Amino acid sequence: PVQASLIMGTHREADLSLKRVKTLLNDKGYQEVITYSFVDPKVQQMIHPGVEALLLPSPISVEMSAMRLSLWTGLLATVVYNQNRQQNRVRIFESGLRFVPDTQAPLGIRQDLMLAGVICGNRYEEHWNLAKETVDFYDLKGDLESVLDLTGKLNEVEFRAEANPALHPGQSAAIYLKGERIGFVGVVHPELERKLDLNGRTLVFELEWNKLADRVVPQAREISRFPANRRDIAVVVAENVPAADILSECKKVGVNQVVGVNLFDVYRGKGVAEGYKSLAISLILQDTSRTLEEEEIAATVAKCVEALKERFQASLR
Amino acid sequence: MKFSELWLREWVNPAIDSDALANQITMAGLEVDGVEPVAGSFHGVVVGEVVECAQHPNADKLRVTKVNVGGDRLLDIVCGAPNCRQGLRVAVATIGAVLPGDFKIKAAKLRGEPSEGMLCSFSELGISDDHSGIIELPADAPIGTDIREYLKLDDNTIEISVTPNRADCLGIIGVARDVAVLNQLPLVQPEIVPVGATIDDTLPITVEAPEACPRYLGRVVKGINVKAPTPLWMKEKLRRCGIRSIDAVVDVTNYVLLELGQPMHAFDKDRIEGGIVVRMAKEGETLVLLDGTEAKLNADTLVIADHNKALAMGGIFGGEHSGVNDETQNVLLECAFFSPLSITGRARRHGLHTDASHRYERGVDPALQHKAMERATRLLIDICGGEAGPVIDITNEATLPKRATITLRRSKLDRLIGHHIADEQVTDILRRLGCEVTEGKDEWQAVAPSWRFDMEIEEDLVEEVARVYGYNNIPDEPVQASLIMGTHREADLSLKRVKTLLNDKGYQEVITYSFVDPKVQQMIHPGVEALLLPSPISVEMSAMRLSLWTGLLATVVYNQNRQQNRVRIFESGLRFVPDTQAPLGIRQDLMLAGVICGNRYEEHWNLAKETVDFYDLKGDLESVLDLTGKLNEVEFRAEANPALHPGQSAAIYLKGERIGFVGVVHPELERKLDLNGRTLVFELEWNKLADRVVPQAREISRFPANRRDIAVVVAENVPAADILSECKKVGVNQVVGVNLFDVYRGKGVAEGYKSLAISLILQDTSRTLEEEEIAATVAKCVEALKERFQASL
Amino acid sequence: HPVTRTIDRIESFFGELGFTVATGPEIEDDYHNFDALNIPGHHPARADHDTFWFDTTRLLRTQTSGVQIRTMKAQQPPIRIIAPGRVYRNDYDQTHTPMFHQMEGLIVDTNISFTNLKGTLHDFLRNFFEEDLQIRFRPSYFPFTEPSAEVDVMGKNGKWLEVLGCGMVHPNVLRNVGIDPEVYSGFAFGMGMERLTMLRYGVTDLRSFFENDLRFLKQFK
Amino acid sequence: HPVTRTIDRIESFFGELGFTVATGPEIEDDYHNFDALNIPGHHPARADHDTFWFD
Ligand SMILES: C[C@@H](CC1CCCCC1)NCc1ccccc1O
Ligand SMILES: [Mg+2]
């Protein structure tokens, strides 16, 4: 056996293990997949039209002659592959490099490690007590929020509606962390879904791994031995106003006392004018040194309502 | 161990401040626990004399006083202390002085008479709790001098933890000797000249247990004044070491204990019938200790006795009769060396713990008795008067312990430490510690000094060399070793992998105490006797847990009492079940348990509020069991459990072995525990699922498969899993999948009967199937449900 | 649980050095908890040890030494194990709970020295607190090691803070498990997980670990 | 993925011996894939590997 020193090396608790994220995805019903780094440029052109990919002179075949600009060509080819074998429900993910031509990158090609995945079919397998419903946008986002919650920075994640040629423009989001774009998520565009011959609605995502490979190290905070108070507010805004921004404003305006902000209902129909919506939000208030009385509770709740008035032109009901 | 820094500095005074000296003592191995000031913070208090003292003309119990403080003229002071009288040397807080508590001394009148300061008690100066009267200073106290300088109140008491190896560090001399070695300084020792005897008085002393007492020193002092006051300098050194002053004879013996580490005792010579007999006690001897209580002694306990009765416990505690009292005029001073093994454990047996027993059971210097006897003799007669007889020396050279001769090898020193310390430094360190060292070829032969009881083998000298050289002067070096792989087993399932899945299903890990309240555990596991602690921290933590449910259910109640109804937690840990076939009569199995309650999810804009039920927890349990790859061989059988709902509880079986339980907490148990609502618990024997299946690639059919649904109506009490298991077992290699997707009972099915909608997937690895063979197989499956169960529809 | 976070980090630190995790029962006999560690029946650190006894032989362990003694008896060197587990003492204050967690390490090889003890634990402390922090080794005493030491970390308030204990395995301990101290040597160490967790994440009350308030535990996800 | 299980097992075997995992890009240059490995341009390994070149 080798006779050498025993030195530990340098660890960093703030690192987020990719294997830990894979374990979470497995525990959410996802199978790991490994696809070829070179794909058919015909298919990739249907997904990323007009984007010139680094091509292989003298490839193994024409269908494996283009370095993948994302992981979606290989992923979407895998679900079609399985759907041709009588398997409609496909929930898979893959980690691997993408190759985007970039003159400012070494060797003229930028090589980023990505985490991507796709889901389709029913939410669950056939079950005597689980309803047969096709998977939707908020199913995939729920799994993505589970992944991003491992960083401890979920309070700083944003899903902004953003156009991507491969995605349905009304159900697609660019993902942001602390203002930094980290990925994209949405249902595949129906025309792109009609192409490739996909069985129904399919949901894809892709995350730049190194953007979220860090996590917050916990610092203990004191717990109040005094009881907390809940106050709900009804907030009516225009439809196009994102609900997460109202929540974000509430948390930012009430920092000292407001220890919790949660949306529990969103209503748009009879009772609210067309083109508008009402957001039911619970505000939990607590203090570490005393119990709160109605005067201070009402003052802070009013402080949050006025901030929603200033920023969103919201109204209380 | 408490001691005065200034007293220690009388023996060794390194040119460094209190913080550094205390750090040095800590770095010697005597960790300082605290450093406290000797007196309160004040200024403007000086030595004075009561020149004139008279009755206060307007207050019955006050006095008016002229005080000389060495100023231009005498001061008018009013004093109400009972001991105030003319000629007294006192501590005078003059005008402008500030006393502890920001108590400024101003000139004022008290009951009509002027007072230009006040006479102070020890309590007012923050020196002690003495407020019975004003401080009385020695008659030669220097008038006008700051009492902080005269009483040395700029001093600290240093408290150190002394581990049992450093038996030599239970006195001023021993702590100072170690500090001197660390500073490469000599030790300054008091001149202790022997007291010459002026009378011939003795008494017979015979030792029947010379193994327990290799040396006993008796000495008589005739005609002492037991009522003589202890001088202030001795009261202060006693107090700054944590010992209050009692009477003059006990005070001198406590002083030599503090100074030299030698315990000593004083008998009333007139209450000694015959002589002194240092012997073992008889089995069942009765002795009334000095605290008034009676002790029933065993034959392994050493006693100091006379020719009739036992007088004291040797080196532990004194008796009530033979001690010094108010009428005592003649004393017999004891100063002995007792064998540590003969004293150890006896004090704890009778709930005793004294300064003497603590030192004797760790080891007092067997070459110290004569010097300590002469020290006490002079101090006693200089305080209480009297005449000293000759020293009665009963020493047994055969049982007297011998100084150890130890060989320190260069090879062992360099190997254990890993750092070469020069030869001259090694021999210098050992000699300053008191060893007789002769150098050899790559070796040292050392004779340990008489006071060290932790120098028997070579490694002891390695530590002495290392600790004096300096631990932090030794460099760092990585371990050299072989890079040999451990033995891995891919079939191992990790507990950390299971904890991760539970986290990814919404479970928070908790850790609870292993001893619980038997009042509440007897509610969860009634009739099951648990292992109890005879001496618990409390009765609510006196029963070793038979499961993890007592800790988990106390945790949800705790959180629910703090406005949190929804709690989903788990825990891994041992249970303790009495088992005569187990090691130590108690079987300790590693368990994995958890509990959920409240709504399935937190409040959500797209999820509706629904309370958790049995199939929610069972789903999480199937996710855990699926990690083993043996979920096909798991059975949930309804089974009785006193803590659980009889209609919603199941025993978990794996390959015909019960591995755990799961179910809704019984509603009456829910009531008694003050649970907010429906609560579901589980528990698994961990080692039964710490093993998993290693995958083995099987061929996949390239030919399509076919699905046929059937609706079977059976009895309401027939478990659906047995029906599914029958379709999978009775079916040949054609049917590859059996799944239940509906369970109906109501308008259409008879009462007490249910319809189970089952999907059967059929496929072959070599060919494709057609309707003939397909329908013949679902017909074969449905006929298997005819005799064992009921027909279809 | 935050204590689990700590135990997992330390297991990964020493796992890269070839240290195997070993566990054992929490109820032990006086042999594996005292006698095998060179602590005779008359030894002070035994009766005056705040120990929970059931009878004269069975006790709630004060250290995870039982698994370390059994491992040494069952194999010759090299030995490289760490032993985490719950231990028990009678005290109960703001900084003391009757139950707590201890991580104990042991390595036994041919030329294990005190210099290796310093370097290994200095590496460990630098990784655990993730900084080039001030530490010191300080003479101490344990019946099962010689030389013995405690290591302190410079506290944020200017005072040294005792973090762990260590030493070179006593030759009596090696002898009664069948290991020749003239051929083999080794060092061992022990540390409390609650203490290190408090210093790492800023927890100020040790009792919070066992109250299991979901608001305290949720901070450590 | 089955090969991921294999990689993770091998990483844990050598990790106990102090072997640190290191990763890098998959498109490499002439120097790091051949030249620094004692494989000059006139060495048959630049063809015995049957390399996918871009230029
Ligand atoms: C109680 C011991 C038990 C081991 C010691 C020697 C070999 C047997 C097991 N725990 C490790 C340890 C080491 C040094 C100081 C404190 C400490 O806690
Ligand atoms: Mg020693």
To which H or E segment does residue B419 belong? none
| B381 shares a domain with B288 | yes
Ligand 2 centroid to residue B167 C-alpha, Å: 11
Phi/psi for A196 (5° steps) reads 65, -15
Minimal Cα distance from A224: which residue of C?
C215
Contact C17 D18 (CB under 8 A): yes
Rounded Cα distance between B736 and B243, Å, is 87
| B87 shares a domain with B8 | no
DSSP-derived pairing of the beta strands A315-316 and A229-238: antiparallel
- CA dist list (Å): A19 to A217, B750, D7: 19, 53, 11
Q: DSSP character for B455?
A: -
| B640 shares a domain with B672 | yes
- CA dist list (Å): C183 to B236, B481, C166, C180, C186: 54, 15, 21, 5, 11
Query: Does residue B571 contact residue B512 with C-beta atoms inside 8 Å?
Result: yes
| B178 shares a domain with B150 | no
Rounded Cα distance between A299 and B384, Å, is 79
Q: What b/e readout covers B17-28, taking b as 16+ CB neighbours within 10 angstroms?
A: eeeebbebbbbb
**Distance from C119 to chain B by nearest Cα, in Å?**
4
Rounded Cα distance between B443 and B689, Å, is 58
Q: Is the CB of C185 under 6 A from ligand 1?
A: no
Among A95, C27, A51, residue whose Cα is nearest residue B579: C27
Among B122, B114, B137, B132, residue whose Cα is nearest residue B47: B137
DSSP, collapsed to helix, strand or coil, labels residue B700 as: coil
Q: Is residue B190 part of a domain?
A: no
Domain locations along chain A? 8-216, 225-317
| B735 shares a domain with B622 | no
Pull the structure tokens for residue B527.
């009739």
What residues of D are in contact with residue B483 (Cβ under 8 Å)?
A: 17-18
DSSP-derived pairing of the beta strands B317-318 and B330-337: unpaired
Bridge partners (DSSP) listed for residue A232:
A282
Query: Does residue B664 contact residue B644 with C-beta atoms inside 8 Å?
Result: yes
Query: Within an 8 Å CB–CB cutoff, is residue A9 touching chain C?
Result: yes
The minimal CB distance from A34 to the residues D3, D18, D26 is found for D3
Rounded Cα distance between B3 and B14, Å, is 17
Residue B504: other Cβ atoms inside 10 A: 18
Phi/psi for B305 (5° steps) reads -135, 170
Q: Is the CB of C150 under 6 A from ligand 1?
A: no
Neighbours of chain C (3+ CB pairs under 8 A): A, B, D
Q: Is the CB of C188 under 6 A from ligand 1?
A: yes
Q: Residue C99: CB partners within 8 Å, gap ≥ 6?
A: B513, B514, B515, C86, C87, C88, C210
Minimal Cα distance from A149: which residue of C?
C221
Pull the structure tokens for residue B291.
């605290």
Helix axes C193-201, C2-15, angle to 10 degrees: 100
Residue ID of nearest Cα to ligand 1 atom 4: C65
Rounded Cα distance between B266 and B245, Å, is 16
Ligand 2 centroid to residue C143 C-alpha, Å: 9
Phi/psi for B364 (5° steps) reads -100, 150
Q: Please tell me the number of Cα atoms within 13 Å of B114 on its side-chain side.
A: 8
Contact D17 C15 (CB under 8 A): no
Contact A13 C130 (CB under 8 A): yes
- CA dist list (Å): A26 to A132, A150, B430, B627, B720: 21, 15, 65, 11, 28
Rounded Cα distance between B631 and B625, Å, is 6
- CA dist list (Å): A32 to A81, B164, B190, D4: 15, 61, 83, 9
Among B3, B364, B380, B383, residue whose Cα is nearest residue B161: B3
Data resolution in angstroms: 2.5
- CA dist list (Å): B492 to A82, B631, B689: 31, 16, 9
- CA dist list (Å): C68 to B464, C33, C65, C121, C177: 27, 11, 5, 19, 10
Secondary structure (DSSP) of chain A: --EEEE------TTB--HHHHHHHHHTTT-EE----SEE-HHHHHHHSTTPPPPB-SS-S-GGG-EE-SSSHHHHHHHHHHHHTTT---EEEEEEEEEEEE-TTSGGGEEEEEEEEEEEESBSSSSBTTB---B--HHHHHHHHHHHHHTTT-GGGEEEEE---TTEEEEEEEEEEETTEEEEEEEEEPHHHHHGGG--S-EEEEEEEGGGS-B-PPP------SSPPEEEEEEEEEETTS-HHHHHHHHHHH--SSEEEEEEEEEE-STTS-TTEEEEEEEEEE--SSS---HHHHHHHHHHHHHHHHHHH--EE-
Secondary structure (DSSP) of B267-334: EEGGG--S-EEEEEPPTTEEEEBTTS-EEEE-TTSEEEE-SSSEEEETTTEEBTTTS--TT--EEEEE
Rounded Cα distance between C141 and B167, Å, is 12
Rounded Cα distance between B521 and B554, Å, is 10
Residue B281: other Cβ atoms inside 10 A: 23
Q: What b/e readout covers B677-688, taking b as 16+ CB neighbours within 10 angstroms?
A: ebbbbbbbbbeb
Among D19, A8, A15, residue whose Cα is nearest residue C124: A8
Rounded Cα distance between A316 and A305, Å, is 7
Ligand 2 centroid to residue B459 C-alpha, Å: 7
Residue B188: other Cβ atoms inside 10 A: 12
Q: How far apart are the first and last CA of chain B?
A: 90
Q: Could you tell me what percentage of chain B is helix, strand and coil, using 3-state DSSP and rounding each to the nearest 5? A: 25, 30, 45
Ligand 2 centroid to residue B188 C-alpha, Å: 25
What number does the ligand 1 atom closest to the CA of C36 have?
8
Contact B741 A126 (CB under 8 A): yes
Rounded Cα distance between B704 and A242, Å, is 47
What residues of B are in contact with residue A226 (Cβ under 8 Å)?
A: none
| Domain stop point among B445, B475, B505 | B475
Residue among C144, C174, C176 whose CB has most ligand 1 atoms within 8 A, to mutate: C144
Residue ID of nearest Cα to ligand 1 atom 7: C169
DSSP-derived pairing of the beta strands B205-207 and B276-280: parallel
Q: Is the CB of C100 under 6 A from ligand 1?
A: no
**Approach to solving:** X-ray
Query: Does residue B646 contact residue B640 with C-beta atoms inside 8 Å?
Result: yes
Minimum-distance ligand to the CA of B165?
Answer: 2
Rounded Cα distance between B610 and C144, Å, is 58
| B510 shares a domain with B602 | yes
- CA dist list (Å): B478 to B75, B418, B475, C163, D15: 74, 11, 10, 21, 18
- CA dist list (Å): B574 to A283, B492, C96, C146: 41, 20, 22, 33
Rounded Cα distance between B45 and B29, Å, is 39
Query: Does residue A93 contact residue A203 with C-beta atoms inside 8 Å?
Result: no
| Domain stop point among B666, B693, B720 | B693
Q: For an interface test with D, which of B479, B480, B488, B493 has the most D Cβ atoms less than 10 Å from its Cβ?
A: B488
- CA dist list (Å): C35 to C29, C30, C42, C46: 10, 7, 10, 10
Query: Does residue B162 contact residue B30 with C-beta atoms inside 8 Å?
Result: yes
Q: Which value, in Å, is the radius of gyration of the alpha carbons in chain D?
A: 16
Phi-psi region of B683 (alpha: psi -120 to 50; beta: other; left: phi over 0): beta
Helix axes B458-469, B423-432, angle to 10 degrees: 100
Query: Does residue A157 contact residue A179 with C-beta atoms inside 8 Å?
Result: no
Q: What range does the domain containing B244 cover?
A: 197-395
Task: Count how many domains chain B has.
Answer: 6
Among B633, B626, B629, residue whose Cα is nearest residue B653: B633
Token pair 């130890």: residue: B406
| B617 shares a domain with B500 | yes
The minimal CB distance from C99 to the residues B466, B484, B513 is found for B513
Minimum-distance ligand to the CA of C145?
Answer: 1
What residues of B are in contact with residue D12 (Cβ under 8 Å)?
A: 488
Rounded Cα distance between C208 and C212, Å, is 7
The minimal CB distance from C17 to the residues A8, A12, A149 is found for A8
Contact C201 A217 (CB under 8 A): yes
Query: Within an 8 Å CB–CB cutoff, is residue A8 touching chain C?
Result: yes
Q: Is residue B191 part of a domain?
A: no
Rounded Cα distance between A285 and C48, Å, is 49
Rounded Cα distance between C82 and C9, Å, is 13
| B587 shares a domain with B489 | yes
Phi/psi for D33 (5° steps) reads -95, -25
- List, in sequence order, the alpha helices (H) in C21-64: 30-33, 44-47
Pull the structure tokens for residue B489.
């087993």
Minimum-distance ligand to the CA of B406?
Answer: 2
Query: Within an 8 Å CB–CB cutoff, is residue D3 touching chain A?
Result: yes
The minimal CB distance from C124 to the residues A8, A218, A220 is found for A8
Q: Is residue B222 part of a domain?
A: yes
What single letter denotes the amino acid at residue B40? G
Query: Does residue B158 contact residue B1 with C-beta atoms inside 8 Å?
Result: no
Q: Residue B783: CB partners within 8 Å, gap ≥ 6?
A: none
Residue ID of nearest Cα to ligand 1 atom 9: C65
Bridge partners (DSSP) listed for residue B218:
B334, B392
Query: Does residue C7 contact residue C103 with C-beta atoms inside 8 Å?
Result: yes
Contact D4 A37 (CB under 8 A): no
Largest CA distance in chain D: 41
Pull the structure tokens for residue A24.
């979470």
Sign of CA dihedral B241, B245, B246, B251: positive
| B344 shares a domain with B418 | no
Neighbours of chain B (3+ CB pairs under 8 A): A, C, D
Rounded Cα distance between B38 and B236, Å, is 9
Q: Which value, in Å, is the radius of gyration of the alpha carbons in chain A?
A: 24
Q: Is residue B480 part of a domain?
A: no
Q: DSSP character for D41?
A: T
Among B687, B717, B488, B705, residue whose Cα is nearest residue B587: B687
Pull the structure tokens for residue B549.
């449910």
Q: Residue A43: CB partners within 8 Å, gap ≥ 6?
A: A73, A76, A77, A196
Give B 547-576 residues with CB within 8 A of chain A: 563
Q: Is the CB of C144 under 6 A from ligand 1?
A: yes
Rounded Cα distance between B30 and B160, Å, is 6
Minimum-distance ligand to the CA of C61?
Answer: 1
